[PDB]
Symmetry: D2
Subunit: 249 residues, 4 copies
């Protein structure tokens, strides 16, 4: 029943939405889970909700010293990593005209830079035969109004799964990108200015998607679990689109 | 523990290699499995190996009347289909110069035509919310010497998963393509002329593949299971490469 | 001024739409053009419109003996081929449910089978350093209602350009796929039942396309010219989307 | 004969390799060309080699004020821009383990950040109906050892062509990515430590490429010309692989 029995997993962006739903599923499948994020309140709540086999770690992935501290804790508590889900990321809508340097840096620091260092500093603790999952996005293959940096960053993240497949093959570490479409999580709500707008952005995505609905966080976690588990043992360097068909038709 | 409990599945090409390994895994996960193929001896042996919850059906997918008969049996015995794995297919190496009309028809009849009618005639029995998996190939995105028709046919198969995602969305039926790389199955042995050559074709593919090895049939089955199961509930119309990174780097 | 000066070109599907516009542009660029098709009236009109350096040849690409005859004529008149544009193809809308064997064979015979033999029988006459262009379609990467066989066939055509890039590299022959989106040609009109419907199918495609308009045949020809010319001398095995951004965003 | 007659074009990275070969070809086709780069010596030499209708501008794309100055000059001298070729970029080889923050910022500043602001600040001067060409790379779809940031940056650049296809469609400005493979330019020599190594890195790429050779800068320029010209008037948001078939087979 337990497809991740006694495996140790680290999930950045674990106190919310996709990160948290995956943490739950992971624990359900008998893993020990480190959830990682900046907000202490939410971390504590997420850990409470998860219930068992979980450690909350406060860290900002754009801060190298926070990562070092993270992996020290990981090392003390469990000693090695079987599954790394480099999932923390963020979107701010700006069109080409509106792009400032600060906006650019905010996007690329958390989505690309933070992720690069998240994976680099996990390397000493990563088990041979382990599995790294990167959270790209359908944005990374689409041309969406005012998504200039987000989309570019996530296209960067998909590339890294290809490169790290070659760089880590010697250790039999599998690296795969998951690209979600519309998933019912705080990232949608936190970008609109009004709760009215959010009802409409969701109905818009549903119309565009063959399966006629936004995805549930549970469903992204299940896709990530596949990549985390032995089931994907011959799956390497891919972009797994979990978007109800959005980019496929 | 049982991710396909009481679900009814039909697998063309089920007496051998990938089809059979999937049948096993399916039954292990509590499904009832129809295995389908031409050779009666092997069908009976496969059913024996599988052991429980299995029905062998003799059918040639290029023969419409065989398909009608298949689905009559399916209907009588179980009534409906939750998972269809349209997997039967075959390869014959010929270069552009060498291509005869007979060769062309042999490839396209089993790989494309047979498959089309396999799925068409399953539609009445297919459950709403069900899952169809088509077996494409890495050939469908590569330019491999003397693979002219095979590769084209399998690229045709990947396309059908996109089209049928749109045509079946109303019934919430998910259709996905699985594209295997080198997998340790009879299809490799049955195309060479000598047992010596086969040792070398396997070592060649291993060198080309980041994971440094041919895949085990068990591993393709696990990938197919993902697509068959609820875990992929928000995965539609995709090409899942199970090739150890071959086409990804 | 003349980018195809004294080069000999063969264009199947040359009496209409894309084939003809390319023939014009080719002759404008100083090529000698064979146009090829079934309808004698239209062939003669097309040759008239083109004006100079053109030979019309009646042939059905699904008939091997018509191809042999074609290449006999080609050989007698000009002796060799610098540019082959395997362009003849046809669409009939039918959903999965509606698919008959006759429909299937009609689509695959002209779009895939005919094309394969078109290119195979050109090989003896094809110049080293020559250029073959296959006409795929945006359909080959999309999931369009009732396009089941068309789309699959054109996805097959794209594959062949990859395979033939490998098989013909020894002779330095470049093979590339051109995939058009909506282009203002008879293929749109000939599939609807009413002239009213055609006004609406065109306005629908325009809305879906970033450039906000259907393409002019002149524009597909220019894209084909690029692939035919020395400009694309380091371009091999590609899918050149001429669709105003349809499949790219 | 003159495909870019009286059109004004701006080429970042124009004193060297691809930038310069494209500048030459552009002028040959009757354009007026701004070449842009950091090194004053080379700029002056490039302008000398080009001969006519050229203005050299010293600018560092990572420096906003340099760009502002560049576009002031452009505006005073020629007023508007018909063709922007955002081409400046740079590679430094480092594996995941080896990645420092400085290395990361060097790559992403020139390859991604600089390019974003290059295109943003051209917008006021860009003509309706104009053409923007971004230089991605085959690296953006491959997993190459120690190409971690380069490949991710270039994958970011391809994304930008998608997003800007949508954002600029209103003004009928076409944005396309060109992704070169191995091209015979200083970027190959400037990354090795020894002139011996460079003979071997070139023979390695030649073996991997169907056309059996590295590309000439002249050949990338011809491909860029196609994108710059009216020939590609219905080609938007694409990735044009100019790699002799490297990524296509
Ligand atoms: N949901 C969708 O439909 C969708 C679609 C496309 C892509 N995605 C991708 O999914 C990922 C997140 O999934 P989501 O939608 O669940 O987003 P979400 O609901 O907003 O969750 C994002 C998580 O990332 C964390 N985070 C942000 N910056 C961080 C930093 N510097 N250090 C550590 N943690 C950081 C947040 O934790 P703190 O708040 O505590 O920092 C939060 O827990 C993002 O990469 C996003 O691009 C989601
Ligand atoms: N393993 C790899 O390296 C690889 C690579 C690329 C693609 N693939 C694809 O994976 C799929 C499965 O292959 P496999 O590993 O199971 O190898 P296989 O056993 O050699 O392939 C044939 C399987 O389907 C059955 N079959 C063939 N034609 C049929 C027809 N007309 N009607 C009914 N059944 C038919 C075969 O035997 P019966 O005649 O007894 O039914 C057998 O069960 C194939 O479609 C293949 O193209 C495999
Ligand atoms: N323009 C678009 O919207 C669009 C979109 C996607 C793909 N395409 C592709 O573009 C290509 C040309 O389409 P089009 O716009 O030119 O359509 P069209 O105006 O209908 O012309 C199709 C051409 O193919 C020829 N043809 C058909 N069957 C043939 C056979 N057995 N032997 C020889 N010639 C045959 C026709 O000549 P006869 O009738 O005299 O034989 C005709 O000249 C096709 O391959 C099509 O699939 C076009
Ligand atoms: N040739 C290939 O095999 C290949 C393969 C993949 C991609 N590419 C891409 O093709 C593009 C052109 O490369 P190339 O072959 O011509 O190589 P190159 O000879 O190194 O040229 C790179 C150009 O970028 C300019 N540049 C670099 N940093 C800059 C900055 N901060 N500000 C302004 N200009 C800057 C350089 O001028 P200064 O240094 O004088 O400023 C130089 O002219 C590059 O982006 C490269 O990524 C080439």
């Amino acid at each position: 029943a337990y497809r991740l029995l006694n495996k140790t997993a680290v999930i950045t962006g674990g106190n919310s939405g996709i990160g948290l739903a995956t943490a739950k599923r992971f624990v359900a499948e008998g893993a020990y889970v480190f959830i990682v994020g900046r907000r202490r309140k939410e971390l504590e709540q997420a850990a409470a909700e998860i219930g068992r086999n979980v450690t909350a770690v406060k860290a900002d992935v754009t801060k190298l010293e926070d990562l070092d501290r993270l992996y020290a804790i990981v090392r003390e508590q469990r000693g090695s990593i079987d599954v790394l889900f480099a999932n923390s990321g963020a979107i701010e809508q700006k069109t080409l005209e509106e792009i400032t340097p600060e906006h650019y840096d905010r996007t690329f620091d958390v989505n690309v830079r933070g992720l690069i260092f998240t994976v680099q500093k996990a390397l000493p603790l990563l088990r041979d035969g382990g599995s790294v999952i990167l959270t790209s996005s359908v944005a990374g293959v689409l041309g969406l109004q005012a998504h200039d940096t987000y989309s570019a960053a996530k296209a960067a993240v998909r590339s890294l799964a290809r490169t790290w497949t070659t760089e880590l093959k010697g250790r039999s570490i599998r690296v795969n990108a998951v690209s979600p479409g519309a998933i019912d999580t705080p990232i949608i709500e936190n970008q609109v200015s009004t709760q009215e707008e959010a009802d409409e952005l969701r109905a818009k995505f549903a119309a565009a998607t063959p399966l006629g609905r936004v995805g549930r966080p549970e469903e992204l976690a299940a896709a990530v679990l596949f990549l985390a588990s032995d089931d994907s043992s011959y799956v390497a360097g891919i972009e797994l689109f979990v978007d109800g068909g959005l980019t496929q038709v």
